[PDB]
Symmetry: D2
Subunit: 193 residues, 4 copies
Amino acid sequence: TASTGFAELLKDRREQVKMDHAALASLLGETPETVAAWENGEGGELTLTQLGRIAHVLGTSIGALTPPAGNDLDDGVIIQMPDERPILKGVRDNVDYYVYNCLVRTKRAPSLVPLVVDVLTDNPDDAKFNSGHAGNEFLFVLEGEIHMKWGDKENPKEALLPTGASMFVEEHVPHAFTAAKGTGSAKLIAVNF
Amino acid sequence: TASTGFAELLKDRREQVKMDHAALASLLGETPETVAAWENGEGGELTLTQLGRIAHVLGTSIGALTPPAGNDLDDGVIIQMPDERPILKGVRDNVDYYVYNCLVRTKRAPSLVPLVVDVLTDNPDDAKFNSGHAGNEFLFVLEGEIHMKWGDKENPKEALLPTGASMFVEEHVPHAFTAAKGTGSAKLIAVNF
Amino acid sequence: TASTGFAELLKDRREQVKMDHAALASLLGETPETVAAWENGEGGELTLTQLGRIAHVLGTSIGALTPPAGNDLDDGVIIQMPDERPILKGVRDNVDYYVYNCLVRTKRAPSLVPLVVDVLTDNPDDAKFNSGHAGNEFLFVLEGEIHMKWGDKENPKEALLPTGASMFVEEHVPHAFTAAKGTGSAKLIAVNF
Amino acid sequence: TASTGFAELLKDRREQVKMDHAALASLLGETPETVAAWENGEGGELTLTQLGRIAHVLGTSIGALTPPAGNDLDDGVIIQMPDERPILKGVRDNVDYYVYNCLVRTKRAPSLVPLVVDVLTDNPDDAKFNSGHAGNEFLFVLEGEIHMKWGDKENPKEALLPTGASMFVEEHVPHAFTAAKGTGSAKLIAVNF
Ligand SMILES: C[C@@H](O)CP(=O)(O)O
Ligand SMILES: C[C@@H](O)CP(=O)(O)O
Ligand SMILES: C[C@@H](O)CP(=O)(O)O
Ligand SMILES: C[C@@H](O)CP(=O)(O)O
């Protein structure tokens, strides 16, 4: 089906730009039958590069010729239990900064990446900024008091957030968190979308 | 500025469809000076209906002629403290079903509506479905055990979710929650986007 | 209607951000009955600025609250006869540069603005550049020979185009046209989509 | 390159969903070194199906992982001469119905497919409907008189269009053309955007 979505999108496009197997094969240096093969479902083994070419000849992108991520929902829903969360230990400059408890995701919303981040450090002076990232992010202070930092890492803005505080960080904005000074650690809910 | 964004978008469009004050005024039954007035910043008092017409004559929509919601961020961020959350008591069939503790919102993401919902009822048999709503929603079980229901209200699907469970409910999918049977109540984090 | 579209959309939004009449009415300095009235179609008299405030209060834009341009097609089609097309003389620096013969348009595609442009001047050295414009444009040399100029007005790239040539000009790219030198006039058919 | 675009995009995604090489490599039955290799441009040989799996595992689509069609403009412009335009004979039911004279196209606007269509038949009763097609279309009667048909092939609406007429056909709406009866042939200029 990753080879079927292609079979038809290739056809949609070939006809969209007004070509035929013979005409297309020619720009790609392939037999007119080869092409028809792809349009059947035999495109499965085409290499990434080969797809870069095909997309090119048809003046479009690989993405346009491939199918969208399938649908992984059970009647519009998808659940995840606490003990099935993927865990990722985050380390910045050989320091256990965060711990990512990845929450439920769906191919129907590829950009939605929910997380429960354990903020390990509690020394604001050593907060480590990222360079910011694409996608707006909504945060919620689960437990503890969070020490937030955003903007220019050199002279950034700050905020002390109590449990229950809710934040929004526009995409590309650099930011960093730590537990409140000396308080040990805090927990957070970060939802990227 | 709700009258300025208009002043220029009106101009952008008038010229976009190749008209002049005189030509435009004519389709609207207005003086050529009236129009120029609007394009200055004097459009402020134009009624909704009057705007429905102007958009029509210019074969576009009111929205296209009005400015986007401003920007309400402090260097890409916006915080909200626990004691400044708007509260809305939800009642279904004269029953205190939920309680909406509205979290941080931003005009930069008009669709993002974060909530902390208190699920008051604990009798799954009397769960009240909505008709579903636009926008995907991410849920997280804050406290208690949640009894979820989705799909057809008559013969719906169910799920018992422990604290920490995370769900996703595709837009338009009907759903309902209650505390686990007899457990009194549960708390949830619902993020619509 | 605009007052009906607004009445349905306003209700949706209010409910989205979890506000009841009372709640919304407060932030606006209005009475719950007034807000209920609006959702009942009685909002047509609302000025552009109050709509701007209502929008802001509901943390969104006026467009989100107003209805789509609407549909003016006839079973999916909209036709226009040669004799019924709008005209606009384009003068630049006190010299008739173009004449715009506006072709079919539609609310189902506002961004689409097709035209038949009469290139009046025939002296390249006195070409008059535009500043570029939102939206891409497709052109077709109808009659005569066109001498196209695009890019930096103080140093443009050029191309002499014969009848039948077709070109694409990405948005916000500046460009200018004139008939081939001495040839008097040329004719294009521009399509802004 | 496709292998470079994929290499940069793959890295972004992996980091987005909070997976390290090891984590991703596992779900794919590959070694951490292999995954690191891909992010290092060495992924060109990957077949369409593995790309489909890698995509799926990263809960997204192949397109999200591949680069944009690319840019083929010349300082914002792309030109095409009359003699260099592609041609495709359109036969329906064993009868030459159209001849497609493909105009300029671009990767910066794949959806844009302009054409000069020669309407070969001149008998309305034997019109050959298409099934409609994605994307809206703008038409212009170049030569002759066109006898347009759209809608339900078993009961179409009709319109005789003189040279210079312009029409819009919303996407997925079926339509057919033929020269005015007996007039031999007509000429259109179709633009699918
Ligand atoms: C809370 C989380 O957003 C921090 P980072 O992963 O973006 O650096
Ligand atoms: C949890 C929340 O989404 C229930 P409803 O407000 O959509 O009915
Ligand atoms: C041909 C036409 O696009 C010239 P301008 O109206 O954009 O200045
Ligand atoms: C004029 C052209 O649009 C006819 P078809 O190619 O869509 O069938």
